[PDB]
């Protein structure tokens, strides 16, 4: 996680630390304001919660001091000293700030006092970034945390009133916490201090969709999803009545590490009356949409809600399905708006969506519409085509959608099953993904047209000369005598293709041959019993290798083929 | 077990029941005489233990009455009534008798009284063979068992004094228990009863090897091994001194059902001073000889011996290794005497012997000598050849014995590895058995000549023109450019054979080619880059299929080959 944190902790853009810290400042406020309810005293009278930035020209320090929830010693040791010489859940929001901060500064100093704790139990922390941190019990009367930055020789860039104020607003905007800054005017005798907020300060989601710029939207995704790839696109939707909730969903441009662990990240940030209640709550998404990220501010749920109350009760189930559609909404929408970006989304989340048709039955059609496959239309492994792109191609009588389920692209693309339809002028869905085979067990019918796998048949190829069939009946008898009962039967089918023969099965195998193939004719010219049996044995062993990719005596097949070549 | 019990319970030969019953009579005596020691009273004064046969002309019944150990009710119910409407361990000795008896008789009546039990707790048993048996508490003063046979209409054959006496001795001979029979002479007033034994009565193994006929030896194997295939051959050996023990081992002609279970049968019958002590004790064989069957009469072991004392102590370990050699002795011997019968033994026990070289290190050479493989000498899957038969073929400089380890005959026989030596004029051991691969890890060296698998190389083929090698170095470069790094290297070896190319590995793969093959020349004539790559790709994919029997994209390989054929 941190490596591709570092690449842009560079950015070359440096000033990043400030943002990331303000992020921390906010989340701090939240966790505080949350913990408030269960012990209304922790505010200690000081209820105007905020964050004040300051700086000293002579000692050359920048100084971010919030009055959130602060830290217990153990927390300072468990976090800051897990950064010196769960844990990635601290590196989550906090890591970026740390390392980034040490880009601009050469000594960093923390000075906390966790909300509620006695002012003697405050804490102190310092390091020159090296393999060494220094932590000590100290006193700090106020509540919260104070971070101070010994600036590195030659970064006076950050002592410039205008530069800082700028760098502030360039993030302060999308942030719910009042971000003040040091206004000191020195008159002779009265060196007067006051603090001015550069921030509108208002939960961005509680604001109205018109005034919220794309910037505020993107950067807000950063701050809530601990990612700094820009998001793909979002959904800011309010609701009044019984269910009065606001909700704001995003869709990431790039999928996280632990998407393919059974260890989470997922969930949405659940507020109740503009008050944080928990991060990464995962009731409000179906598991086939887990990649959804964002928050939801309900005015209906209990003020003492738990993950138990959520998971069990019913207002959740409703809230879920609603948000679900909201998301499918967002995707269909993005699908038609910026197909460039959706192609991105698909390459980044398809495999998870594909879980959907089995899970959320209700919206099954809508989900299908979102899928994006690859097909014989173009010989690229790229998964561009859609179910409409397919129906839009269909020919008369083509009442089913034809697909194949392999283990990889080249495989499916090589399969003989294809050439029947590739010749007759049809389109074939190439499902060269792991899950696909399971998917189809639920992806039964779309747009009135059912799905039917080439790897079998019924009344699909039942419709899709007879004298060659006649002479084929003497040939058939010759074969049935040649083998007998290693094969359940012998048939002559017109899976035209360029492959001679093929085994099949019902709902040992059934041997099938193609009257129109050169090898079939050059094996029909055979009277010599040696080559007769040799050819036929080759063909059977072949169709086996084609349907199982393994042979009893491989070296034998190899020997036979190599013989008929040189001769 | 019973089905191939029935086939010869037929025999057509009928009279079999009598034998099988007398068998029962003996074993009965034994278990009794054994139980005697731990409670010397059970003899009830009656110490002349025996078995008396009688018969009634008018009621038409034959009547075998032994004074062994009898049966508790529960035993009569658990055994005889497991035969009506462990358990195969009762069907072991007893089943044959039962069913056979009901061949000659139409009602059978048992009448027991288990040794020690009160005469009121005797038991009674009867049936017309059908799905119905009848058992009742009864009184019988004497100890032991009495079996009575209501003879079937038209089998008066068995009421004939001479017929019976004959049928008696035709088994009584090899049996250790005195087999008496009813001598009644009717004088007017004195209808006098006495009993005359038709049996020498003496533990056949305690007798001397000269007087014991082959009959007595074979039939005795029957009686101890509950089998009535004739044995293959045996070993009757006595020992005096510290270890004074007699021992008599056999080797079955046919291997039992449960040879290939992890549920036993094996073990030898351990006597201590001519007194049975336990059947199927398996300390006195190594597990690679478990198919050994027979008994051993020690005069040294404790009179209160357990399987614990046996397995743990040391006199066993000695006794074992001794008997072990005795068995290898017996086999070498049979190997040279009747190669017809040994071929039988091998077909019937080889796979178990083959466990040996890993287990019994001491006799490892001797064991090897016994093995019997199959080799290119003749294209039959039959495993006739031996390690001497091989050395007796060897050519100058051939310092190693060459073998191949496959999954089946045709496989190993098809392998390309062979043709190098098949051409250069050598012999190849075909090990197409499961265990072989494990065996060789211990079967390192024999008769000074080591073993070396064709499936690898060292200084074996290091010894077993250079201008073709030169031009091959331009060709090699062309190939190394064609592929690059899907193969660790490209080489040209002279594994002459008729196979073009082959991958190898050390102690991805290494690609190797045969300058002398037609396909190699017809691929050296190639300038067209399309076929150039097409040929080479084919060759690589081939050698893969040859060394793994599976391909990434099989249908592709198939397509390529089929193309080059028709074109």
Curated annotation (Swiss-Prot), chains A, B:
Q: Where is this protein found?
A: Cytoplasm; Cell inner membrane
Q: Which InterPro entries match?
A: HATPase_C_sf, Heat_shock_protein_90_CS, HSP90_C, Hsp90_fam, Hsp90_N, Ribosomal_Su5_D2-typ_SF
Q: What GO cellular component entries does it have?
A: cytosol; plasma membrane
Q: What is this entry's stated membrane topology?
A: Peripheral membrane protein
Matching Gene3D superfamilies, A to Z? 3.30.230.80, 3.40.50.11260, Heat shock protein 90, C-terminal domain, Histidine kinase-like ATPase, C-terminal domain
- Please list where the region (A) is annotated: 1-307
SMART domains (UniProt xref) = HATPase_c
Q: Where does ATP bind?
A: 24, 66, 98, 145, 226
Fill in the PTM field for this protein: Phosphorylated.
Please tell me where this protein is predominantly located: cytoplasm
Record GO terms (molecular function): ATP binding; ATP hydrolysis activity; ATP-dependent protein folding chaperone; identical protein binding; protein folding chaperone; protein homodimerization activity; protein-folding chaperone binding; unfolded protein binding
- Which biological processes are named by the entry's GO terms? DNA damage response; FtsZ-dependent cytokinesis; protein folding; response to heat
Region named B = 308-507
The record's section on PANTHER family has: HEAT SHOCK PROTEIN 90 FAMILY MEMBER (PTHR11528)
What functional role does this protein have? Answer: Molecular chaperone. Has ATPase activity.
Q: How does it assemble?
A: Homodimer. Oligomerizes at 65 degrees Celsius.
Report the sequence similarity comment from the record.
Belongs to the heat shock protein 90 family.
| Protein name stated in the entry | Chaperone protein HtpG
């Amino acid at each position: 996680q941190l490596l591709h944190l570092m690449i842009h902790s560079l950015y070359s853009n440096k000033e990043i630390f400030l943002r990331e810290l303000i992020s921390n400042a906010s989340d701090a406020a939240d966790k505080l304001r949350f913990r408030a309810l269960s012990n209304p005293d922790l505010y200690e009278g000081d209820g105007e919660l905020r964050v004040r930035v300051s700086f000293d020209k002579d000692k050359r320090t920048l100084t971010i001091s919030d009055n959130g929830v602060g830290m217990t010693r153990d927390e300072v040791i468990d976090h800051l000293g897990t950064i010196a010489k769960k844990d990635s859940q601290l590196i989550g929001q906090f890591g970026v700030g740390f390392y980034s901060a040490f880009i601009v500064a050469d000594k960093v100093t923390v000075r906390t006092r966790a909300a509620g704790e006695k002012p003697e139990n405050g804490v102190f922390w310092e390091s020159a970034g090296e393999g060494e941190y220094t932590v000590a019990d100290i006193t700090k009367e106020d509540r919260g945390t104070e971070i101070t930055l010994h600036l590195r020789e030659g970064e006076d860039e950050f002592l410039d009133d205008w530069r800082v104020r700028s760098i502030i607003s360039k993030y302060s905007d999308h942030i719910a916490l009042p971000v003040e800054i040091e206004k000191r005017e020195e008159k002779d005798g009265e060196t007067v201090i006051s603090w001015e907020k550069i921030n509108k300060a208002q939960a961005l989601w509680t604001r109205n969709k018109s005034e919220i710029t794309d910037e505020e939207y993107k950067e807000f995704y950063k701050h809530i999803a601990h990612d700094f790839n820009d998001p793909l696109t979002w959904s800011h939707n309010r609701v009044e009545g019984k269910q009065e909730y606001t909700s704001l969903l995003y869709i990431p441009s790039q999928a996280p590490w632990d998407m393919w662990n059974r260890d989470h990240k997922h969930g949405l940030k659940l507020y109740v009356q503009r008050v944080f209640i928990m991060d990464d709550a995962e009731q409000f998404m179906p598991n086939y949409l887990r990649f959804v990220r964002g928050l939801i501010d309900s005015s209906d749920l209990p003020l003492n809600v738990s993950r138990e109350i959520l998971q069990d009760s019913t207002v959740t189930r409703n809230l879920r399905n609603a948000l679900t559609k909201r998301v499918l909404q967002m995707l269909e929408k993005l699908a038609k708006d910026d197909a460039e970006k959706y192609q991105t989304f698909w390459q980044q989340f398809g495999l998870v969506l594909k879980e959907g048709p089995a899970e959320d039955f209700a919206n099954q059609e809508a989900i299908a519409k979102l899928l994006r496959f690859a097909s014989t239309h173009t010989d690229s492994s790229a998964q561009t085509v859609s179910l409409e792109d397919y129906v839009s191609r269909m020919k008369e009588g083509q009442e089913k959608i034809y697909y194949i389920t392999a283990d990889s692209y080249a495989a499916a693309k090589s399969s003989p099953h294809l050439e029947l339809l590739r010749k007759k002028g049809i389109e074939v869905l190439l499902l060269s993904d792991r899950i696909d085979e399971w998917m189809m067990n639920y992806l039964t019918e779309f747009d009135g047209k059912p799905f039917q796998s080439v790897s079998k048949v019924d009344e699909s190829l039942e419709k899709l000369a007879k004298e060659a069939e006649k002479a084929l009946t003497p040939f058939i008898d010759r074969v049935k005598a040649l083998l007998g009962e290693r094969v359940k039967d012998v048939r002559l089918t017109h899976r035209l293709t360029d492959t001679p023969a093929i085994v099949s099965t019902d709902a040992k195998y059934i041997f099938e041959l193609n009257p129109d193939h050169v090898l079939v004719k050059r094996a029909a010219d055979t009277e010599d019993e040696a080559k007769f049996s040799e050819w036929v044995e080759l063909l059977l062993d072949q169709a086996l290798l084609a349907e199982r990719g393994t042979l009893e005596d491989p070296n034998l097949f190899i020997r036979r083929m190599n013989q008929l070549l040189v001769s």
